[PDB]
Specification:
With 486 residues, the protein is an alpha/beta fold. Helix content is 45%, strand content 13%. The structure holds a molecule of 3 linked components (BEM-BEM-MAW).
């Protein structure tokens, strides 16, 4: 027995966890065996290993009505709230009060996070992934390519065009100026012509503009930005396979000495300098401040969230609600944050000076440390309290200089934190928003690739947003916002 045991009798719980369109809970994960060893709760993965769409899997699972004991994963918040209210998950408030001292104490100290995750009925239907940190993504450019071509790091959008055009036309390596492992980043490019693409680290999020709730993709600023993005795409400044390359884009495009420029996270993006040192002679990425946009400002639209829309819930089928909440509580305690952030003691880390310290092999490894942790069951989107010291330990000094530059320059835009809708308001949001958003993404794709001309289609686009309920959503969001702020 361990001090962390939540039951004396071993308990197997069925988990449906399908995430990032690729992965399921793997009971072979060292971290999962370590979770079992420390908690005496074993998880049994029932999600389809072959499926390549996480959100449809959750939906089909719900549809089938063959529910497991626990459901977890990414971008589940809205569904945890909707299906919890409908009786598929149980509320957690009273379970937490009585049996989850760590989650309890976390919510009491973070009342804005509690508030962000509650359903209109005041119920907590899930335990969230809680990030730790300040900045998220930044702009990175090939300084070795800047040198080769004798070009200054670009200071504004006119200069960025000129630099990227030069990566294209002058063969600094087949050269592909902009690449990204997140296709949504292509739309974030509208930032350079003074348009938002999001109000938060969640892509295609709402924002507030002088106390008006707006969607960035509805705005004519977005229209004009997108006409430039399509042009850049037409010119091959953007990876032709931007929408399909995905997760391994950096391994492929930087490793193969093809990619010049990206917008990604500081810790992992900057490890490629050490990692690709043997295979690509003199590969050097530098963090750059966001080149000034057409409106005369330097925008970093992205920031680390106080709570992400990911985590896990307890289904109606769970015959062991009490053991389960105690199992969730583990990941909000020191030893649970240890394994879920650091991996396995004696394998990927050891306790030194009262804290988890990654081993030398983990730190010197060419793979980003978070990628190493994914492969073993850690830094995955269950309900857990992230510890930024895990990240600090593999943040290079060069990555840290870049962050400090972002912090000093005040480039990071304030994030949208959500609104607190009533039952009726949130019902409209739930009825429409998913659909609206998928249409927006499909339209944006069409504009970027040149399938549709932004100007000839902007009006039918507005028409569509209207009959797809977007403006009805915004009005309900505006009502909730005004109740709270104005
Ligand atoms: O890459 C880093 O340096 C880094 C440091 C932090 O400790 C986190 O690990 C941060 O994690 C990101 C990770 O970079 C990816 O962005 C992943 O992205 C998923 C998003 O959360 C969305 O769900 C998206 O639709 O899919 C993304 C994907 O899987 O690529 O999420 C984590 C995160 O924020 O936890 O990276």
């Amino acid at each position: 027995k361990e001090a962390t045991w939540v039951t004396d009798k071993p308990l197997t719980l069925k988990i449906h966890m399908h995430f990032r369109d690729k992965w399921v809970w793997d009971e072979n994960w060292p971290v999962a065996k370590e979770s079992f060893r420390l908690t005496n709760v074993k998880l049994q993965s029932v999600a389809n290993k072959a499926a390549t769409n996480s959100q449809e899997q959750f939906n089909l699972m719900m549809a089938s009505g063959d529910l497991p004991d626990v459901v977890g994963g990414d971008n589940l918040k809205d569904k945890f709230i909707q299906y919890g209210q409908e009786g598929a998950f149980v509320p957690l408030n009273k379970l937490i009060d009585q049996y989850a001292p760590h989650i309890k104490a976390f919510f009491k100290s973070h009342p804005e996070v509690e508030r962000a995750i509650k359903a209109p009925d005041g119920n907590i239907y899930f335990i969230p992934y809680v990030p730790d940190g300040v900045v998220a993504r930044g702009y990175f450019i090939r300084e070795d390519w800047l040198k080769k071509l004798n070009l200054k790091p670009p200071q504004n959008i006119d200069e960025l065009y000129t630099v990227l055009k030069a990566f294209k036309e002058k063969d600094p390596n087949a050269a592909v100026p902009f690449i990204d492992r997140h296709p949504d980043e292509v739309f974030r490019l509208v930032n350079f012509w003074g348009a938002r693409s999001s109000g938060s680290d969640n892509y295609m999020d709402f924002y507030i503009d002088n106390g008006r709730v707006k969607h960035p993709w509805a705005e004519t600023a977005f229209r004009d930005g997108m006409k430039h993005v399509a042009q850049w795409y037409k010119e091959g400044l953007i990876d032709k396979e931007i929408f399909t390359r995905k997760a391994r884009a950096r391994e492929q495009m930087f490793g193969g000495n093809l990619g010049g420029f990206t917008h990604d996270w500081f810790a992992s993006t900057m490890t490629f300098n050490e990692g690709l040192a043997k295979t690509v002679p003199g590969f050097k990425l530098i963090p750059i401040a966001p080149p000034t946009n057409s409106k005369g400002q330097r925008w970093e639209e992205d920031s680390r969230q106080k709570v992400r829309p990911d985590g896990w819930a307890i289904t109606v089928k769970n015959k062991n609600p009490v053991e389960t909440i105690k199992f969730f509580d583990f990941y909000f305690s020191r030893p649970g944050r240890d394994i879920s952030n650091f991996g396995v003691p004696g394998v990927t880390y050891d306790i030194k000076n009262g804290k988890a310290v990654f081993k030398d092999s983990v730190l010197k490894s060419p793979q980003p440390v978070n990628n190493q942790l994914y492969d073993m069951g850690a830094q995955i989107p269950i309900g857990f309290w992230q510890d930024y010291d895990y990240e600090r330990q593999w943040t290079t000094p060069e990555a840290q200089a870049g962050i400090d530059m972002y912090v000093k320059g005040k480039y990071v835009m304030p994030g949208f934190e959500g609104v607190n809708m009533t039952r009726e308001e949130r019902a409209i949001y739930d009825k429409y928003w998913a659909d609206v958003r998928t249409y927006m993404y499909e339209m944006g794709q069409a504009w970027v690739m040149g399938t549709k001309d932004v100007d000839k289609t902007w009006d039918e686009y507005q028409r569509q947003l209207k009959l797809r309920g977007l403006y009805q959503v915004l009005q309900m969001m505006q009502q909730a916002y005004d109740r709270q702020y104005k």
